[PDB]
């Protein structure tokens, strides 16, 4: 019965709250206070990447830490060589409303999707020497917001239809469907071991998913508005979420609650992208105001600022070796910072 | 080697310039409307599980790409941001009076959104033959939904569109004035609403859009050429 089940759900919510409060013997701030501040993190723009006609919506580094793909809503994916700023590829998209792009960890494929509700997989290593649409994954009933390769044959995508999906690229059919979110799923972060992924979905809640079982292991709340970005902590035991309430938050999977909140009274704009540094000491967050902030992920202090974009900072990315961070903005420029 | 990489980059950049020409010369429009609005029919008047439809048409050698939202959920606060650089939003609203307050709220949200606060709205008050039939019939009263209509009187400077009974003119101009009030009460001259009385059968809708885009582009040219 509806009312009976509602009361049961509320009682279980109280039980979970009490359990995670009992686990909350101490706070992260009370434990990290004895560590030395990180200091002022001063970072400079080593490169600026020009060539996109419209706003950049997403970017993703290659595993080699040199090549990076960016997607613009003028209808192009550009694979750049960040060292020289040479454009390695320029893929014209069949739908110009792209909202996400991904780089296969092997470098052989890229992926992109958007308001067309389709994840297009592009083969970069064709024998003919020209890029082609390898596959078109269809089945989502809403815009794709994020996508991320598990492998050359598996990709996990999040959609505005409130569900995520694990696909088999060879057959082009959803191997698994992840359901349980109520709002649009905005971003997903794949775990370092690739056996889990987290997703933030415009309902002020994030969820942890087991790829193989296809079920929601944990649900984390604490945000006041939509979650636009989610990133895994490098060890894979925590993740950071940025939201429209103008705060970032850190969640630990095993403690199952929120550890730290990164916010300031002078920030009244939403977070569009988040990323952790190589060691996880610095958390980099792009904001609706045109500059990014670098936070001491342990002490929750704003260690630095990356200013230099004339419009919204839409995407963020740290290389696998941690040598540089790329920021892409709605002014259509990607800037590499170091 | 590095020389070959630079050569490939330059070859790519040539194509990028070639595409920049086309991208800059084309005008992109976002077509918004409710289910009852006849926007689906307006698209068919542009005779030159997918989540977006594009119809590309041409007026006096100018190319317009008009985008109609396809299979999307009713929550639009996120994908709407994709359209912060279109030249215009064609907002189609049915005149049936009741969904009018819903359309007013949609227009208000579009107008006051941070990312749509510089986009001009071409407002198609569609289905005006239906509005005339409904007003003349007398069975449906606008006052039952908009009490301020009980004391609204037609402005003396309003164009009459000859052949309209004064009641039809009063009703249609009150409906127009609602949206115009929403548009002028907030923001500033950074964007403009262009109201039109239209029917889905009208063959001049395309022309209207053209006439409005010329103005919209004009307003940006005044800035781009140091005139304001």
């Amino acid at each position: 019965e509806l009312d009976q089940l509602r009361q049961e759900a509320e009682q279980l919510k109280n039980q979970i709250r009490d359990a995670r409060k009992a686990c909350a013997d101490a706070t992260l701030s009370q434990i990290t206070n004895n560590i030395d501040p990180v200091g002022r993190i001063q970072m400079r723009t080593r490169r600026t990447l020009r060539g996109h006609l419209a706003k950049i919506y997403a970017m993703h580094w290659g595993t080699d830490s040199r090549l990076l793909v960016s997607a613009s809503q003028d209808g192009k994916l550009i694979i750049w060589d960040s060292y020289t700023t040479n454009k390695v590829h320029a893929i014209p998209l069949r739908s110009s409303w792209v909202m996400t792009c991904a780089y296969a960890p092997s470098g052989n494929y890229v992926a992109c999707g958007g308001l067309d509700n389709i994840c297009s997989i592009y083969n970069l290593k064709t024998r003919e020497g020209n890029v082609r649409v390898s596959r078109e994954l269809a089945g989502h009933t809403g815009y794709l917001s994020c996508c991320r390769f598990l492998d050359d044959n598996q990709i996990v995508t999040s959609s505005g239809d409130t569900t995520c999906a694990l696909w088999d690229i060879e057959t082009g059919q959803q191997t698994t469907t992840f359901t349980g979110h109520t709002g649009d799923v905005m971003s997903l972060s794949l775990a370092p071991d690739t056996r889990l992924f987290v997703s933030g979905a415009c309902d002020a809640s994030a969820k942890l998913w087991d790829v193989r079982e296809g079920m929601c292991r944990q649900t984390f709340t604490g945000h006041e508005s939509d979650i636009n970005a989610i990133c895994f902590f490098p060890n894979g035991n925590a993740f950071a979420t940025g939201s429209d309430d103008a705060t970032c938050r850190l969640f630990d999977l095993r403690a199952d609650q929120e550890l730290m909140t990164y916010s300031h009274d002078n920030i009244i704009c939403g977070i569009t992208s988040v990323s952790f540094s190589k060691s996880g000491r610095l958390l980099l967050a792009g904001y609706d105001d045109f500059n990014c902030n670098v936070w001491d992920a342990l002490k929750a202090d704003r260690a630095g600022v990356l200013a230099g974009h004339d419009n919204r900072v839409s995407c963020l990315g740290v290389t696998d070796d941690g040598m540089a961070v790329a920021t892409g903005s709605w002014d259509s420029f990607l800037k590499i910072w170091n | 080697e590095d020389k070959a990489a630079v050569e490939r980059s330059k070859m790519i950049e040539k194509q990028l310039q070639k595409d920049k020409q086309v991208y800059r010369r084309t005008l992109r429009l976002l077509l918004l409307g409710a289910d009852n609005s006849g926007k689906s029919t307006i698209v068919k008047q542009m005779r030159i599980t997918s989540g977006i439809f594009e119809t590309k048409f041409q007026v006096d050698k100018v190319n317009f790409h008009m985008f109609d939202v396809g299979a999307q959920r009713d929550e639009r606060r996120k994908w709407i941001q994709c359209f912060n650089d279109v030249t215009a939003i064609i907002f189609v609203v049915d005149s049936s009076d009741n969904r009018l307050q819903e359309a007013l709220n949609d227009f208000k949200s579009i107008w006051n959104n941070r990312w749509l606060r510089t986009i001009s709205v071409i407002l198609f008050l569609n289905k005006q033959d239906l509005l005339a039939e409904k007003v003349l019939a007398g069975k449906s009263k606008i006052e039952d939904y908009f009490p301020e209509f009980a004391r609204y009187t037609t402005p003396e400077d309003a164009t009459p569109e000859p052949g309209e009974d004064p009641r039809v003119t009063r009703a249609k101009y009150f409906i127009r004035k609602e949206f115009v009030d929403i548009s002028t009460a907030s923001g500033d001259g950074r964007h403009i609403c262009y109201p039109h009385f239209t029917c889905s059968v009208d063959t001049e809708n395309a022309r209207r859009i053209f006439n409005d885009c010329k103005d919209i582009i004009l307003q940006m040219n005044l800035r781009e050429y140091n005139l304001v």
Epitope: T182, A204, S225, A246 | E75, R76, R77
Partner: nanobody, 128 residues
Amino acid sequence: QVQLQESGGGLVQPGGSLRLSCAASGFTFSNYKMNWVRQAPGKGLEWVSDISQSGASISYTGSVKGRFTISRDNAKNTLYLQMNSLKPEDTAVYYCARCPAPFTRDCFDVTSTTYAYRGQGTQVTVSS
């Protein structure tokens, strides 16, 4: 967690009055515009009224203007709708919704497909 709990409202005779209250938890109540929405039997969701962060700006739908009044108390994180001269057509489930993001002027909160930041509603019935 973000939760909105509405109380008050029920069976009332035509021409009566009812004060609906909504307690908000999980977010800074003063940073968001608040809205009253309703769903009548056999119809879709309909926006009733809205009140800004400080209450300085208010708006009502025409069918209720002059009868209902919206108010907010930020110290108590509560939203009130005082409804006078109830009409039979006001029979509906009343939901309290809030703007999706803080410090904004626009709202997108009448959606049927489970808008996240509104409550479960309270039934208000007007009958003889």
